[PDB]
Amino acid sequence: PYLRARGEVFSEIFPIDEAVVRVLVEELKEAFEKYVANHKSLRLDRYQLEAVKGTSDPAMLADTIAYHATWTVAEKQEILELTDLEARLKKVLGLLSRD
Amino acid sequence: PYLRARGEVFSEIFPIDEAVVRVLVEELKEAFEKYVANHKSLRLDRYQL
């Protein structure tokens, strides 16, 4: 104790074609509306959907929907594995479709 | 190194009877429209149309 760690530089790389990525943002907003309005059962909150509307950062958007769709720490870590903007919404959509 | 090349004629043909030609243009244009819209998560912007 305690542990030191070196780390990589800022991940400032996000893919091209923001039209398809923001359509995927819209579809993730649709799926999260369909999720929380049907899952009040996980003690989920509805001020988590004001935290997605009116913002222009798809990274902040995707992290907002990923954390506020609550699950275990390991799957949020699996989201933290991905460096792509495009497959992270695939991960969130697949988990919410499973639930 | 390095190479030169010599050519007899400049071959290129340019459209005649352009009704069927613009039918094929519209078909390949909307086909390429349908081709680009599939890449949800790989590459290939819709910004190239």
Task: Give the orientation angle of helix A58-68 with respect to helix A73-81, to 10 degrees.
Answer: 160
The Cα A64–Cα A69 span in angstroms is 8
Mutation site, A16, A18, A20, interface B, largest B CB count within 10 A: A20
CA dist A82 and A25 (Å) reads: 17
With CB atoms and an 8 Å threshold, state whether B47 touches A86.
no
Contacting residues for B16 by C-beta, under 8 A, at least 6 apart: none
Q: What is the resolution of this structure in A?
A: 3.7
Tokens of A46: 């509805």
Radius of gyration of chain B (CA): 18
Q: From residue A63, give the alpha-carbon distance in Å to each of A48, A69, A91, A92, A95.
A: 12, 10, 12, 10, 14
Q: What is the DSSP string of chain A?
A: -PPP---PPP-----S-HHHHHHHHHHHHHHHHHHHTT--TT---STTSSSSTT---HHHHHHHHHHHS---HHHHHHHHH---SHHHHHHHHHHHHH-
Sign for the CA dihedral angle at A28, A30, A33, A39 comes to negative
Q: Hey, is B23 helix, strand or coil?
A: helix
Do A10 and A76 touch, CB atoms closer than 8 A?
no
Q: If you count them, how many residues does chain A have?
A: 99
CB contact set of A85 (below 8 Å; sequence gap of 6+):
A14, A15, A21, A58, A59, A62
Report the structure determination method. Answer: cryo-EM
Between B41, B43, B44, which is nearest A90 by CB?
B41
Residue B1's SS3 state is coil
Q: Using an 8 Å CB-CB cutoff, list chain A residues near B33.
A: none
Distance from the first to the final alpha carbon of chain B = 40
- Please give the distance of CA A82 from its chain centroid, rounded to a whole number: 11
Contact B40 A86 (CB under 8 A): yes
8 Å CB contact of B45 and A86: no
Interchain pair A86, B44: CB under 8 A: no
Interface of B with A in 5-34 (CB under 8 A): none
